[PDB]
Amino acid sequence: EPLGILQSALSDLRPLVTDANKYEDVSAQVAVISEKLIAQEQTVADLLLTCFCQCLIAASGTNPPDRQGQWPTLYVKMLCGHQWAFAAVLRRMLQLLRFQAPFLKDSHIVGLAAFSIHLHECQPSLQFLITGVQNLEHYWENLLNLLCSDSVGVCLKLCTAAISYAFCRFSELHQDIFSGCVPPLFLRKLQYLVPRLIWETRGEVADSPLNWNLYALAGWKEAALSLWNQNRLQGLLREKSFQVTFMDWLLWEMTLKSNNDVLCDTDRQEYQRWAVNHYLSESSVVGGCNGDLERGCITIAEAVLQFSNRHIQHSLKSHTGLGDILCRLQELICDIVTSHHQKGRRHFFFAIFYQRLELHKHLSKQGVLEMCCRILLGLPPLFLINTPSEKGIRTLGSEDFWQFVNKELKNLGPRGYALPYNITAHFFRGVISASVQCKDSSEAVNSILSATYSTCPALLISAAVGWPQLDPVLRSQWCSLFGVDLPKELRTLREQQASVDSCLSQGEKLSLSCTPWLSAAFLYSTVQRKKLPCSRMLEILDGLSSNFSMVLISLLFFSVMDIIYMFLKDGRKHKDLLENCVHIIHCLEQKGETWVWLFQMTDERKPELGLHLHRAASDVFLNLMPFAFFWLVPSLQLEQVVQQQDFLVIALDMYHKFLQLFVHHLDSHDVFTCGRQFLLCCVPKCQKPNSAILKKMLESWEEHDPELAAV
Amino acid sequence: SQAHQDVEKALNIFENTGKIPASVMEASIFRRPYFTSRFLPALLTPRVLPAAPDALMLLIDSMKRADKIPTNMFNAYIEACEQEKLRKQKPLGILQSALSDLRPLVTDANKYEDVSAQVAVISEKLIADIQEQTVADLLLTCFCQCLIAASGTNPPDRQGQWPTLYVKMLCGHQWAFAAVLRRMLQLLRFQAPFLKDSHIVGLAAFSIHLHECQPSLQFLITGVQNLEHYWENLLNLLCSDSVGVCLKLCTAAISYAFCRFSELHQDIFSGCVPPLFLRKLQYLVPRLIWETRGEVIRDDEEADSPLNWNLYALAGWKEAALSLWNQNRLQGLLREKSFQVTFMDWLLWEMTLKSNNDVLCDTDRQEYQRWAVNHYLSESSVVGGCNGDLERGCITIAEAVLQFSNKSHTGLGDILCRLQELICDIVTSHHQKGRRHFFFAIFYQRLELHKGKKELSNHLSKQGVLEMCCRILLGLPPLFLINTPSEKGIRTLGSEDFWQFVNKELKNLGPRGYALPYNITAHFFRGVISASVQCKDSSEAVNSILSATYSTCPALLISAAVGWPQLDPVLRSQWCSLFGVDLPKELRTLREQQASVDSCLSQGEKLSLSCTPWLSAAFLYSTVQRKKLPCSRMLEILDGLSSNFSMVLISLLFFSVMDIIYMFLKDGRKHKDLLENCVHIIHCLEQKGETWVWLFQMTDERKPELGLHLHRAASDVFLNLMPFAFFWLVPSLQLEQVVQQQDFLVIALDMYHKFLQLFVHLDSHDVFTCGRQFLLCCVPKCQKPNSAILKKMLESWEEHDPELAAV
C-alpha cells in the first residue's frame, strides 16, 4: 500500500502547519519510508506537488509567509534526498505548463512559483541523469522560452507571484544580498512583458505589497502594477545580471506566434514603433544605441541573419513576428535618405553581409543569399544608389552595389549568365527615382548607364532577357513624373529590340549596334522566347562588318551555359544544342579567328571581350566548363582546331581540372582518347615523349612544366 | 429573408472588435414594432445545441440580457434547446455481389452486354446516416476497381462505354445521387491529407462523367444551382485547407480527358472539361512547381502526342502535371476568355490561404507573390492586369481588401506588406502631379452605395467597411503617406488631404463621440515628426502645421488631449532619437496645460486660461472623468471675472451632453451627470446671461465661431440623436429657460420635429405634454392659444410658418 500511507501523511501535514508548531517536522522523514516503499507512475509527482500547492494556501490567511516557519525547506529536502522523484515533478510541471497552459487555475500558479524559488534556494539540488538538461539553470530557459511564445498570458501571471512571494519571504534582511535569492531570468521577462501588455507604465521614469493578497486578489492589472512602482524593485533591475538589451529583445520578439497572441495586429505595431525608439535613445553600457541610426539598422539585420539559421524550414511553425520587424526597418530607412544633410554613404549595411559569407566561405547561395535579397527588396529602390551631396550639386553614382553584385550573381544557378529579374527592376527603377533630386533629371542617367557597360555588365544582360516585361514601367514612370522625351540610354534599347522583333519576322536585316554582347543577348533570348529554331539566328546577320564574329562568340557562350544547365537537371546531353554550336563555328571558321579563349579560367591574355562576359557568369558553372569542352571538341574536324594559337595549353590545362571533379565515368574514355590523339598532329612544340608521358600517369604537369618552356 | 443577413452582419461586426453594435440599440426604443416578432425570434429561432463546448454567439444574447432588451421570453429559449435534444437524443450483401459481378465482364467483352448487369444493379438498389454513408462508398468504390480492371487490357480511348451508362443509371435516381456529393465532400475534406494515391483518379473520372450528363439537382441543402455552383465550393475549401491534393486532383481530371474525348475537332472539345480546373491549374502549378515560371528554359521533346495514361504505373506527381503543362494543345488553350485569371481573382484566392496549411516556407511564400505582382503589373489591360500604373496596382489591391471582408489574420498581412513595398517608391519620389487624391477616391465611392437607408442592414456594413478603411491606413504606412509637401526651392509640409476625409467620413467611426481612437491620431503626429526632417529648420515646419490645424480638422487635437498620457513619451523619445534637441513651441504647451491642470486639482490654485476654450476644457474634463472625481472639484477652480469664461463653461456642457449618450448606446438607460449640466447652467446665469442654445441648432444661421468649431468634430450618429437629450434634461428647469433666452420656441419645435422623424415610452415620448406647457408661458410672438391647439396635432407647421412672420 504505497499510496494510502502517502495520502495519510500528506494530509497529517495539512493542519500541522496552520500554527508554526516548533520542531513538529520529523513527520516529514516519515514520508521518506513511503517513497522508499514505492521505488509509469506519473502520479507521485502530482501527489507530492499538490501537498505544497494546498498547504501554502491553507496556512496563508493565518499568517504571512515570513512568519510561517521552517516547513518548505524540510519538505524540499525530504523530496530531493531521493534523486528519482526530483526527476519527475520537473517533468510533470513542464508537461502541464506547455500543453494545458490555459486549462489551469489562478491558485495553482503561485503554488508552482513558490516551489520554483524554494528549488532555487537548494542549489545543491543537481542531477545529471536527465537527458536534454545538464544543470538546473538550463531548465528555466528551457520552459520559459517555450511559454513566452505559445502563450504570453501565463508567463506574466507566473513571473509575478514569484516576486510577490520572494518580497514577502526574504523581506526581513538582505540589504544587499537580496539579489541572489530569486532566479535571474524571471526578473528579465517581466521587464519585457509588463509594458507590452499594459501601457500605463511605458515611459514614466512604502512597506510591502498588500500582505500576500494573491490568494484572494481582485485581478492582475493591479498586482503587476502595485509591484512595478515599488522603489525597492526599480532600483534592482539595473545590475548586469538583470540587464535586458536590444539584440536579446529582437531574439524574443521574432519568436512570438502571431496567432495565440493576445494583441490585435494593429496594436502590436505601436509597441514596436515605441520600443525601437526607446532603445535608440540610451547608452551603450546598457547595450542600446547612443542616439544614432546606423547602429539601429546594423543591429536589426545582424539578428535576421541569426534567427533564420535555426529555421532552415525546407519545403509548420506559425507566422512568426518576423516581417513586422522588417517593416519597422524601412520606416527608419526613409529617415536617413529623405533629409537635408544626406551625405549618402552606404559602405555600412553591406560589410554586414561580408561576414556571414566568411563564417563558412546551408551554403552561401542556399539560405543566406536569399535573405540579402528579402532584405534588400523591402527597402526603397533608392537605397541602392549613393546620392552624394558634395557641394549641393548632388551628382549620382554607385560603387557599393556593383562591388557587391559582382559577388552575389553566384546565386542564380538557373541560367548562369544572368541575375534574377526582381533584383534588376529596383535598380533601373531607382536611377529614375533619384534624378529628381538632381537639377537636370535627364543628364545623370546618361552618365550612370554609361559608366555601366564597363563596371557591372551583369545587370543589363538581365534586362535584355526581360525587356518586354520592363519597358512599360520605365515609360509610365518617366511619363508620370514629367512628360518629357526619354533619354538616349533608355531608348537605344527599344531601338535594338525593335530592330529584332521585326527582322526575325519575314527577314530584313540587322543593325548591329555598338556593343556586341548586348545585341547578341537580345537576339538569343528573343529566339528562345518565340520558340523559333536555331537557323534564323545565323542567316539574319551581316557578313562584311568588323563586328560580326564578336557576336558569334557571344552566341556560342550562352549555348554552352544552356548545355551546362540542362546537365544539372536530370543529367543528360541535349544533343540538339551540340549541333547549333558547330554550325556557329563553321560560320566563323572561314575567317581566320580564334574561338578558344573562353576556356581560359584566368585573366592572362583574354581580349577585353571575355572579361566583360566571364565577370557576369556564376562560378558554379565555370567549374564545369570542361564538362562541355570534351563534348563539342571531338564533334569537330580533327584538323580545324589546330591551326589556332596555343591550343593544347588549354586542352591539358583543362584536363588537369577534369580529374578534381571525379574525386561522367563513362566519359573518362572519350577525354582520355581525344586529349590523346590530337597531341600527335598538334602545334610544333613536341614530336614525342608527350603522348608517352600523358599515358604514363596523371603527371601531365611534371613534364609540361618543362616542355612549355621551348614549345 | 432579411433579418438573417442582418444577424450575420452583426456577428461579423461582433468578432473583429466586439462589444455590441450601435444601430440595434438605437432601434430598440425607436423601432420597437419591428424589434419584437421580426428580429428577436430571428436570433432565437436558430436555437441549435451548443455545438461548440463554449459560447460562440450566446455572448451577444447574454450581453443583451444583462439589459432589459430581451423580455422574459428569454426563458423559452432554454426550454426550447432541451426539446431539441429530446428530438436528437437518439439487402446489401446481394448488392455487393451484383455490383461486384461487373469487374469480370469488363476486360474484352464490353460489347453492349454490360446492360443487364446494370438492370440488375438498378433493380436491387430500389430497396435501401449509415443507410447512406455506407452505400455511397459502395457505389463510388466500384469505379476505382472497374476502371483499374479495364485500364490494363486497353487504354480509355477505345473502351469506356460503360461509365456513362453506370452514371446515367445512378443519376436516374434522386435520393442517392445527392449522397455521393456530400460523401465526396467529407472524403476530400477530413480524410484527404492521407487516404490513398489511387482513390483519387476514381474521383476525377466521376467528376467529369457528371458533366456530360448535365443532370438536375435544384433541390439540395446548399447547392441550389447546377454543378457550376458546387465545384467552386469544393475546390475553394480544399485549396484553402489542402493544396497538394488540389493539384494532385486537377492534374487527373485533365489527363483522363486528353486521352478520352480525344479524336474530335478542337472547336467542341473544350466543353467537356469544366472551366475551373484549368482556371486553377493556371495558378497552382507555377506556385508549387517552380522551374516553370518563365525564368529558366522551355524544354520540349514530346509536344504533339497524346500523353501516356500512366497514372496507375507512374513515378510521381511531378511528371504527370509537368508532362501536361508542356503539351502544346494545352499551353495554347490557356488564352481563351471562358477561363482567364485576372489581377482581382488571384488575390481573393491568395488572400484567403492561411499559413499553417501551405507547403512552402516563409521566404518562398514571400517570393512567389513578388514574382506574381511583378507579372500582373507588366501586362496589358484587355487581359487582367495593369500596364505599368503602380497607382492602378494599389487601387486594385485596396479594392480587393475591401471586397474581402464581405483581429488576427495571416494571409492579408502579406498583401498589406506588398502595398508598402510598392508605395515607398512613391513618397521617395515626390510626384507633385499624381498625389494622394488618387487613393482616397476609392473609399468615397465604396461609401455611397450605402445611402439607401433601410432596416438596419447597411449602416452595419458601412461601419464594417470603415473599420477596414482605417486598418488599411495602418498597414501601408511608411508613416507619412498622409502628408502633402511641395517644392519651390523649399518644402512647406502642408497636408491639404486627410483633413476632408476626417471631417467627412472618419469622425463617425469610434466611441466617445467627439474623438477618434488612439491608433490613427498618432500617425499624424508621428508623421509630422518624421517628415520634419526634409525641411531645413525642422522646428518651424511643425509649428506651421499645428497652428493651421486649429482652424481646420480640430477633431484631431481633442483626440490627443483625451489621449495624451499614452502619447507624450512616444514623441519625447522619437524627437530625441532623430535630433536630440529641445522640443518646439507648439508640442509642449499641451504638456504645460496638462501639468497645470494636475498641479491645480490636488490643492486648488485658480487655474489660468490659454485663450483657447475648446482645448483647455478637454484636459480639464478627461483628467476628471478618468480619476472618478466629482463635479464640485471640476469648476470650483475657474477664475472667471472678465476673461474668456463662458466658453470654457459651454464646451463642458457640450462634452457632458455627448457622453450622456455613449452611456445610453452602451448597454444603459440613463446616466447621472445631467446634474453637472444643471449646475453649469446656474453658473452661466450668475454671469450676464451667456445663452446656451447654439448647440441645439443644426443650421449655421447665426451660430458663433466656436459653436461651429465644435459640431465639426462630432459624429452624425449623435447629432441625429440630440433631441433625446434635449428632452431628457429640460424638465429639470423652468421660468428662466425662456423669458431670458433668445430663440427658444423655434429651437424646441425644430427638435420636436426630428423627435418624430426618428421612428417610422413614458420615459421616452413624454414631452408631448411638456412642450404643451412652455407655450402658455413663452416669448409671445403670437402664441395666444393657437400653438396651444395647433401644436396639439401633427402639424407644427400648418400655421407656424406664418405665426413666425408676425414677429
CB B534 within 8 Å of CB A340: yes
Q: What are phi and psi of B420, to 5 degrees?
A: -65, -45
Question: DSSP secondary-structure letter at B541?
Answer: H
H/E element, B708: helix B705-710
Q: Is residue A617 in some structural domain?
A: yes
Shared-domain flag, residues B326 and B430: no
φ, ψ at A257 (rounded to 5°): -75, 120
- Which residues are CB-neighbours of A434 under 8 A, at least 6 positions away? A382, A385, A387, A396, A444
CB–CB of A386/A398 below 8 Å? yes
The partner residue sitting opposite B424, judged by closest CB among A314, A334, A335, is: A334
Residue with cell 483522363: B256
Q: Which residues of A touch B389 (CB under 8 A)?
A: 476
Picking from B551, B500, B586, the residue whose alpha carbon sits closest to that of residue B706 is: B551
Cα end-to-end span (Å), chain B: 53
Domain boundary at A226, A242, A258, which?
A: A242
Distance from CA of B194 to the nearest CA of A (A): 17
A475, B388: Cβ pair inside 8 Å? yes
The 3-class secondary structure across B543-579, one letter per residue, is HHHHHHCCCCCCHHHHHHHCCCCCCHHHHHHHHHHHC
Angle at B586 between CA B583 and CA B589, to 5 degrees: 90
The three-state DSSP-derived secondary structure of B37-70 is CCCHHHHHCCCCCCCCCCCCCHHHHHHHHCCCCC
Which of B512, B514, B490, B486 is closest to B502 using CA atoms?
B514
What does residue A144 show for φ and ψ, rounded to 5 degrees?
-75, -35
Q: Do the chains contact at B479 and A331, CB–CB below 8 Å?
A: yes
CA A64 – CA A60 distance, rounded (Å) = 6
Q: What is the 3-state secondary structure (H, E, C) of B136-167?
A: HHHHHHHHHHHHHHHCCCCCCCCCCCCHHHHH
**Distance between CA atoms of residues B723 and B754, nearest Å:** 7
Question: What are the residues whose beta carbons fall under 8 Å from the beta carbon of A117, sequence distance 6 or more?
Answer: A162, A165, A166, A169, A181, A182, A183
Does the beta-carbon distance from A382 to B296 stay under 8 Å?
Answer: no
Which structural domain range is residue B273 located in?
129-338
Searching chain B, which residue's CA lies closest to the CA of residue A264?
Answer: B407
Angle between helices A89-98 and A44-59 (to 10 degrees): 80
3-state secondary structure of A62: coil
From CA B792, how far away is CA B771, in angstroms rounded?
Answer: 10
Rounded CA separation B802/B807 (Å): 9
Question: Are A673 and A566 contained in the same domain?
Answer: no
B152 and B25 co-located in one domain = no
Q: Please give the interface size between A and B, counted as residue pairs whose CB atoms are below 8 Å apart.
A: 171
Q: Give the C-alpha distances (Å, rounded to integers) separating B451 from B440, B445, B736.
A: 19, 11, 42
Which ranges of B588-694 would DSSP assign to H, the alpha helix? 589-603, 619-627, 632-635, 646-657, 674-686
Determine, yes or no, domain membership for B345. no
* Residue B721 CA from chain centroid, whole number: 26
**In-domain check, residue A54:** yes
Assigned domain for B154 exists: yes
Q: For residue A269, which residues of chain B lie inside 8 Å, CB to CB?
A: 474
Q: At what angle do helices A27-36 and A71-80 cross, to 10 degrees?
A: 20
Residues A651 and A609 in one domain: no
Question: Which of A604, A639, A674 is the C-terminal boundary of a domain?
Answer: A639
Query: Is residue B523 a part of any domain in this protein?
Result: yes
Q: For helices B521-531 and B540-548, what crossing angle results, to 10°?
A: 150
Q: Give the ranges where B317-436 is alpha helix by DSSP (H).
A: 328-331, 345-350, 362-373, 390-405, 411-427
Give residue A419's region: left, alpha or beta (phi > 0; psi -120 to 50).
beta
On chain A, the residues whose CB falls within 8 A of the CB of B526 are 273
Radius of gyration of chain A (CA): 37
Residue B613 lies in a domain: no
Which of B355, B424, B480 minimises the CB distance to A330?
A: B424
Partner-chain contact A314 B363, CB within 8 Å: no
Are A47 and A95 part of one and the same domain? yes
C-alpha cell at B683: 453658473
Give B366's contacts in chain A (Cβ within 8 Å): 323, 374
Residue A503 shares a structural domain with residue A618? yes
Determine, for residues B478 and A318 on separate chains, whether the beta-carbon distance falls below 8 Å.
no
Compute the Cα dihedral for B332, B333, B334, B340 and give only its sign: positive
Which residue is listed with cell 552575389?
A: A408
Question: Grid coordinates in use for A446?
Answer: 546618361
Cβ neighbours of A89 (radius 10 Å): 21
Chain position carrying cell 526530483: A86
Q: Are residues A582 and A699 in the same domain?
A: no
Residue B487: closest C-alpha in chain A: A437
Same domain, A604 and A700: no
Q: Are residues B23 and B76 in the same domain?
A: yes
Separation CA B595–CA B507 (nearest Å) = 28
Put simply, the answer to whether A274 touches B570 (Cβ < 8 Å) is yes
Same domain for A190 and A42, yes or no, is yes
Mutate which: A299, A334, A374, vs B, most B CBs within 10 A:
A334
* Cβ-nearest to B361 among A313, A381, A421: A313
First and final C-alpha spacing in chain A = 100
Examine the fold and report which residue of A242, A269, A302 is the final residue of a domain before the chain moves on: A242
Answer whether residue B82 is part of any domain: yes
How far is it, in rounded angstroms, from Cα A657 to Cα A623? 8
Which residues in chain B have Cβ-Cβ distances shorter than 8 Å to A566?
297, 299
Interatomic CA distance for residues A409 and A386, integer angstroms: 21
Q: Do B366 and A374 touch (CB under 8 A)?
A: yes
Resolution of the model in angstroms = 3.5
Task: List the single residue in A261, A339, A414 with the smallest CB-CB distance to B296.
Answer: A414
Question: Nearest CB to A277: which of B291, B389, B577?
Answer: B577
> Residue B424 and residue A562: Cβ atoms within 8 Å?
no
Distance from CA of A536 to the nearest CA of B (A): 18
Could you give the number of structural domains in chain A?
3
Residue of A277, A567, A621 for testing the chain B interface, max B β-carbons within 10 Å = A277
Cα-Cα-Cα-Cα dihedral sign, residues B718, B719, B723, B727: positive
B83 plus B147 within the same structural domain: no
Residue A506 maps to a domain: yes
Same domain, B431 and B563: yes
Q: Which residues of chain B neighbour A334 with C-beta distances below 8 Å?
A: 424, 427-428, 478, 480, 530
Q: Is the dihedral of CA A631, A636, A637, A642 positive or negative?
A: negative
DSSP A133-183: -SSSHHHHHHHHHHHHHH-STTTSSSTTHHHHHHHHHSTTS-TTTTTTSS-
Contact A351, A297 (CB under 8 A): no
Burial of B191: CB neighbours in 10 Å, binned 0-12, 13-18, 19+: exposed
Residue A367 is placed in which grid cell? 539560405
At A281 the three-state DSSP class reads: strand
